[PDB]
Amino acid sequence: FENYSYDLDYYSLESDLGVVHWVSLVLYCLAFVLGIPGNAIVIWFTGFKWKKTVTTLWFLNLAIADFIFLLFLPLYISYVAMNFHWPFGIWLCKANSFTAQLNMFASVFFLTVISLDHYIHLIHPVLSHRHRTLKNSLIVIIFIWLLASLIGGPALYFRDTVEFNNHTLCYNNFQKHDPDLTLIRHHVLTWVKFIIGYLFPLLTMSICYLCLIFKVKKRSILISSRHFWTILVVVVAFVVCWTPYHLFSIWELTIHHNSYSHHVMQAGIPLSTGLAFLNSCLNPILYVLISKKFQARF
Amino acid sequence: ARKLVEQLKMEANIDRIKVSKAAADLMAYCEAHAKEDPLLTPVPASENPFR
Amino acid sequence: TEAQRRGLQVALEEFHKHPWAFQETSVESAVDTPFPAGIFVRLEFKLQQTSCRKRDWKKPECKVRKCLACIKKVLGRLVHCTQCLRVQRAGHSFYFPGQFAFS
Amino acid sequence: SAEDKAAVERSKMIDRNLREDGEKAAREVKLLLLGAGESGKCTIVKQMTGIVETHFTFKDLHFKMFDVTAQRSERKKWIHCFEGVTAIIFCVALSDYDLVLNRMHASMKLFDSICNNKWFTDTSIILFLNKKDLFEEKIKKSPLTICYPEYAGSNTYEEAAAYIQCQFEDLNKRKDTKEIYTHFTTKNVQFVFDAVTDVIIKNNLKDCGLF
Amino acid sequence: LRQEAEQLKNQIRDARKACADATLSQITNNIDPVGRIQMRTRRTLRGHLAKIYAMHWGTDSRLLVSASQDGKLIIWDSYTTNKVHAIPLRSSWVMTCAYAPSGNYVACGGLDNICSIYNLKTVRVSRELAGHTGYLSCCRFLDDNQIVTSSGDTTCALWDIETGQQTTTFTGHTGDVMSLSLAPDTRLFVSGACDASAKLWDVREGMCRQTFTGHESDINAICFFPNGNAFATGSDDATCRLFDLRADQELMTYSHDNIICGITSVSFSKSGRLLLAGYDDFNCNVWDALKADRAGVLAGHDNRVSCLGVTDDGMAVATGSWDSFLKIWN
């Protein structure tokens, strides 16, 4: 009749202090079904022209980022579907967090650089003819990858796995490392993430696309019928999904009227995350396989 | 057209042989150098610089 | 004190609820810090090994055979035999910021 | 095997130099002068053996004009080498309708032959109607009935020039892939710059558009 | 003397037809076909940034020259796909290039009325031969001191590199001269013009001896048989013809109903059994030189195969096309 040994060790952090849950998993499943298959098809079929210009490189990078993000999504759906229980180790949770940040920032930056490149394309016919080399595209994609990989410290110092009552949990811990780091590493990191991953990209997309559509270069030989609708649709798709996620990220203020005052413990934030996954899934299908340039070879 | 007349006369004065003789000579050359043609007889990769 | 005795009794009951019962063997004192909430204690002590009888109630009735307790009638306990900072401040707390992201 | 290392290092240097030269050359814009004859290829835009080279920079754009005054041989033997030019400048000297060598008929024949050609199925043609000052004086003396028949308009410079432009414009048969930029002779350089900018926009959008 | 010229032409035609008694294909039916030929792209040479217009294999069968519209003459090492030399030609319009038999010189030319000769090992300009009023179509090296050129003004010229002046002028063509080939003994050379006629010229004598006709369009390519007693020509009407110098008459014709596009380049194998011809249908095909059949196709080029060549050892064939690539087949 022995449950332990001479040194009795255990841990127990017990503490006494539906309609949305199902929709989140449904959205995750639809995003995954519409994703990995479509992204894999895009990757395998993108051989339109060998060593094609920068647009194919942008599309390949975006598709790869979305494919990795959506193939690591099932880990998140398993975590959320088990009543917020994370049975995996700290190393796997750290790896998932790091790769998720890398993929999402890479996708956002690639979309932003696509918009900037298109704006320089149509508006500028002279300075875009001397700065569109393939080596420059390789340099800028390498810089984008480096910037997305070397931003934020989830490197096992800002994320720890701590089991709560009867449920294991891995989470970002911006505390318990130093008493001096009080409200100086949780808000600064969130603000930096919001300003680099949402503020500058959204501003650039908005200004470039609006100035491109409204003024249409004041020149003819542009099909404004499809172009305007496509630009508006892509802008709407980008805005309507990442915005709730970023407001929930900036919502981490912890004092409005009570402990939560927003009932965030439910699947509202997971639903917004699923909307972000839906936008990531919907981007490649809305860029690469719907335009008039393609759809003629198949 | 004196130059053309002279050229035609020179061409007509050139001796010609039978077509069959030329064909036989070409065939003799072909089967004489057939063994030395790498594009005709396949060459092993042991002595092939292009593998 | 009485609060420390109640806290150690609650910790032993939690031990007996799920992992045979073992009593204290290397007893030790405590310091406590009564200010947040009604009470708060910081008591450490060793336990016994095996048992003379199994399932002999939550309280130890078997005379013959370095922990860490930070409890707040208890709204939270992390007895493991540390994160006492947030538990002592529970009496809004236990947020564990995030919990909802791919991060 | 240090010889192999030296050879591959030399090859790497050679291919780097080749890539740099290709990148430098791709940024420039090239035009081909293909005027009618005795008043064409020897254009007026020059003055500001084999192929004649002209290099000039305008609005941060390096124009290389290839003039063909020699090579009276067959055109199709060397015309296929010019399927890389941004535009073809066709210069027609006005007031030559009365002159015979008939010259305007040869100009139309050359324009139809090159404009409706397989190699230049997408290259833009910039028509330059020169000697308009002499043309205005010659209309008052020599009517436009001797050449370009069915001339119903009066002997006026404006209507005659409009008729010339229409008779040169309607000669094109594609009308979709290529467009003819007609101008009357720093207006010439600005017109050429605008035409080549439009051609660059169209050609580069045909590949990297992605609206 | 139009009547005298017509009578002489009729007599020459009658004498030529008298010697004809049997077609080439009539007596070659006893030779087994060699149509079971499947050549694969052994090597791929890249680096050109424009349409490749001409090439020439080296005597050592390891180094080859290549000319394209970018203005660069590239000398490669086909054994290891390593670029050996890169000459920045001053003229971007290049149609022909040559490699010296001793390997110490290279040649180039095009829409400049000048054939430029460079020395590899002593790259600097060595000679610029000028004097032609038309575009050069083929510069070919006889030795280190004599070169032969053909221009678009219906004139061929045997030059002298040491003096930089023409030594012999060959005239008589009506249409623009398109190609020339040198005999193995370096004493005779046949060249074809746009008038659908190919004339044979003597280097030492400097006068024409034989004229071959029969084509309905321009003759674009020419190449001697390895024995030097015959040569094959390709035209723009999807037709090739074999002519014999001794017979002075067309021997046998290569044509296909499916093929409509003309021939841009042609060459013979080491034994002369295989005739590799490049067409405008984005493909190059091999013909049985003694049976007029097709043994295979060298598909793989993304544009028109402008030029092709066979090594002296005949171990491989190099094809350059407008797709800015070189392919070594073995």
Author numbering:
A (entry chain R): 12 to 28, 35 to 315
B (entry chain C): 12 to 62
C (entry chain L): 23 to 41, 45 to 90, 97 to 103, 109 to 117, 133 to 142, 146 to 157
D (entry chain A): 6 to 53, 182 to 234, 241 to 324, 329 to 354
E (entry chain B): 7 to 128, 133 to 340
What does the paper say about this structure?
Chemerin functions as both an adipocytokine and a chemotactic factor and plays key roles in adipogenesis and inflammation. The chemerin receptors chemokine-like receptor 1 (CMKLR1) and G protein-coupled receptor 1 (GPR1), play crucial roles in regulating obesity, inflammation, and cancer, highlighting their potential as therapeutic targets. Although both receptors recognize the same ligand, chemerin, and share high sequence identity, they exhibit distinct signaling properties and biological functions. CMKLR1 is the canonical chemerin receptor that mediates both G protein and arrestin signaling, while GPR1 exhibits weak G protein signaling but strong arrestin-dependent and -independent internalization.
Aiming to improve protein stability and yield, the residues L323–Q355 at the C-terminus of GPR1 were truncated. The wild-type CMKLR1 or the C-terminally truncated GPR1 was co-expressed with chemerin and Gi1 protein, then the complexes were purified and analyzed using cryo-electron microscopy (cryo-EM) single-particle analysis, yielding density maps at overall resolutions of 3.5 Å and 3.6 Å for the chemerin–CMKLR1–Gi1 and chemerin–GPR1–Gi1 complexes, respectively. In the chemerin–CMKLR1–Gi1 structure, the long axis of the chemerin core is perpendicular to the membrane plane, while in the chemerin–GPR1–Gi1 structure, the ligand core shifts towards the second extracellular loop (ECL2) with its long axis forming a 45° angle with the membrane plane. Indeed, in the structures of chemerin–GPR1–Gi1, the receptor N-terminus makes extensive interactions with the core region of chemerin, with its residues D20–D27 running anti-parallelly with the residues L111–C117 in chemerin, forming a compact β-sheet. In addition, the side chains of the GPR1 residues Y15, L19, and Y21 form a hydrophobic core with the chemerin residue F37. In addition to the interactions formed by the receptor N-terminus, ECL2 also stabilizes the binding between the receptor and chemerin core by not only interacting with the helical region prior to the C-terminus in chemerin but also making close contact with the receptor N-terminus. Thus, the inactive conformation of GPR1 is more stable and the receptor is unfavorable for G protein binding, as evidenced by our functional data and the relatively poor densities of the chemerin core and the Gα C-terminus in the cryo-EM map of the chemerin–GPR1–Gi1 complex. While in the GPR1 complex, the Gi1 protein exhibits an atypical binding mode to the receptor, with the α5 helix moving towards ICL1, resulting in a 10-degree rotation of the αN helix relative to that in the chemerin–CMKLR1–Gi1 structure. The distinct binding poses of the α5 helix are likely due to the substitutions of the CMKLR1 residues S1403.53 and V1413.54 with two larger residues H1383.53 and L1393.54 in GPR1, which form a spatial hindrance and push the α5 helix away.
